[PDB]
DNA sequence: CAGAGGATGTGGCTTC
DNA sequence: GGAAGCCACATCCTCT
């Protein structure tokens, strides 16, 4: 929480941080900032990282490119997208799984609302 | 009203006046836009989009492939096929419809 | 040119 | 009535 001041938020896990996500985005639209999961502790290069989104509307929301490999403490998710909607006025909770042995899981609560239109100009 | 592309085309295909620019091939629900520019012009007019053309209207149709409303007939220029259930919609087998319209082939 | 789809904003309508 | 959703294109573009 230093070198890229406002570029990282804390997850419910003291060993992981992830990029801040838009508060509301259009489904299947590319994120404006590549989602990254940053490992504080030592996480061997190559370690897989997946993210699952969902809430009381979708226990599981359809995503795209939801897998990334840990390279030098960081999992750089290439063009990650949210396909499944999160419901009117409701946001998804991301569950990040870092495939080490044993595996570790960090959570990002109420991280992002996804709708068919996403942020839109007033009518 | 909220007319949709496929519905609009279906209307033209069931109006014998429009047979010069759009018609059934004679094979089931397959049809052809013999004069794409004209069809596009009209579609443009019905939606109030003067700049409308075949290049954009065809994009409309391509969104249907996925939704199983209409598919492309590979190899045949300006040729598509309704893959949805028209009999249910207009209560006529293609053969009967082709007869009402005096569809040649 | 015809034809597949991707990207992104708008018009029409429906839900809360 | 009005914001927030959903669906259908309309436009533009990049490849094949």
Curated annotation (Swiss-Prot), chain A:
<feature type="region of interest" description="Interaction with DNA">
    <location>
        <begin position="26"/>
        <end position="30"/>
    </location>
</feature>
<feature type="binding site">
    <location>
        <position position="85"/>
    </location>
    <ligand>
        <name>chloride 2</name>
    </ligand>
</feature>
<protein>
    <recommendedName>
        <fullName>Runt-related transcription factor 1</fullName>
    </recommendedName>
</protein>
<feature type="region of interest" description="Interaction with DNA">
    <location>
        <begin position="81"/>
        <end position="89"/>
    </location>
</feature>
<feature type="region of interest" description="Interaction with DNA">
    <location>
        <begin position="114"/>
        <end position="123"/>
    </location>
</feature>
<comment type="subunit">
    <text>Heterodimer with CBFB. RUNX1 binds DNA as a monomer and through the Runt domain. DNA-binding is increased by heterodimerization. Interacts with TLE1 and ALYREF/THOC4. Interacts with HIPK2, ELF1, ELF2 and SPI1. Interacts via its Runt domain with the ELF4 N-terminal region. Interaction with ELF2 isoform 2 (NERF-1a) may act to repress RUNX1-mediated transactivation. Interacts with KAT6A and KAT6B. Interacts with SUV39H1, leading to abrogation of transactivating and DNA-binding properties of RUNX1. Interacts with YAP1.</text>
</comment>
<feature type="binding site">
    <location>
        <position position="62"/>
    </location>
    <ligand>
        <name>chloride 1</name>
    </ligand>
</feature>
<feature type="binding site">
    <location>
        <position position="58"/>
    </location>
    <ligand>
        <name>chloride 1</name>
    </ligand>
</feature>
<comment type="function">
    <text>Forms the heterodimeric complex core-binding factor (CBF) with CBFB. RUNX members modulate the transcription of their target genes through recognizing the core consensus binding sequence 5'-TGTGGT-3', or very rarely, 5'-TGCGGT-3', within their regulatory regions via their runt domain, while CBFB is a non-DNA-binding regulatory subunit that allosterically enhances the sequence-specific DNA-binding capacity of RUNX.</text>
</comment>
<feature type="binding site">
    <location>
        <position position="116"/>
    </location>
    <ligand>
        <name>chloride 2</name>
    </ligand>
</feature>
<feature type="domain" description="Runt">
    <location>
        <begin position="1"/>
        <end position="123"/>
    </location>
</feature>
<comment type="function">
    <text>Isoform 4 shows higher binding activities for target genes and binds TCR-beta-E2 and RAG-1 target site with threefold higher affinity than other isoforms. It is less effective in the context of neutrophil terminal differentiation.</text>
</comment>
From Swiss-Prot, chain B:
<comment type="similarity">
    <text>Belongs to the ETS family.</text>
</comment>
<protein>
    <recommendedName>
        <fullName>Protein C-ets-1</fullName>
    </recommendedName>
</protein>
<feature type="region of interest" description="Helix H4">
    <location>
        <begin position="86"/>
        <end position="90"/>
    </location>
</feature>
<feature type="region of interest" description="Helix H5">
    <location>
        <begin position="94"/>
        <end position="100"/>
    </location>
</feature>
<comment type="subunit">
    <text>Binds DNA as a homodimer; homodimerization is required for transcription activation. Interacts with MAF and MAFB. Interacts with PAX5; the interaction alters DNA-binding properties. Interacts with DAXX. Interacts with UBE2I. Interacts with SP100; the interaction is direct and modulates ETS1 transcriptional activity.</text>
</comment>
<feature type="DNA-binding region" description="ETS">
    <location>
        <begin position="3"/>
        <end position="83"/>
    </location>
</feature>
<comment type="function">
    <text>Transcription factor. Directly controls the expression of cytokine and chemokine genes in a wide variety of different cellular contexts. May control the differentiation, survival and proliferation of lymphoid cells. May also regulate angiogenesis through regulation of expression of genes controlling endothelial cell migration and invasion.</text>
</comment>
């Amino acid at each position: 929480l230093a070198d890229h001041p406002g570029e990282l938020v804390r997850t419910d896990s003291p060993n992981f941080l992830c990029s801040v996500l838009p508060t509301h985005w259009r489904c299947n639209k590319t994120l404006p900032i590549a989602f990254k999961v940053v490992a504080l502790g030592d996480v061997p290069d190559g370690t897989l990282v997946t993210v699952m989104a969902g809430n009381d509307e979708n226990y599981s929301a359809e995503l795209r490119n939801a897998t990334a490999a840990m390279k030098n403490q960081v999992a750089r998710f290439n063009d990650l997208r949210f396909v499944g909607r999160s419901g009117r006025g409701k946001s998804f909770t991301l569950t990040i799984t870092v495939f080490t042995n044993p595996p570790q899981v960090a959570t990002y609560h109420r991280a992002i609302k996804i709708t068919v239109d996403g942020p839109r100009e007033p009518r | 009203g909220p007319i949709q592309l496929w519905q609009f085309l279906l209307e033209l295909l069931t109006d014998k006046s429009c047979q010069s620019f759009i018609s059934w091939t004679g094979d089931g629900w397959e049809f052809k836009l013999s004069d794409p520019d004209e069809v596009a012009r009209r579609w443009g007019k019905r939606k109030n989009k003067p700049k409308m053309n075949y290049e954009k209207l065809s994009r409309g149709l391509r969104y249907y492939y996925d939704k199983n409303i209409i598919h492309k007939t590979a190899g045949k220029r300006y040729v598509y096929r309704f893959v949805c259930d028209l009999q249910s919609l207009l209560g006529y087998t293609p053969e009967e419809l082709h007869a009402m319209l005096d569809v040649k082939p």
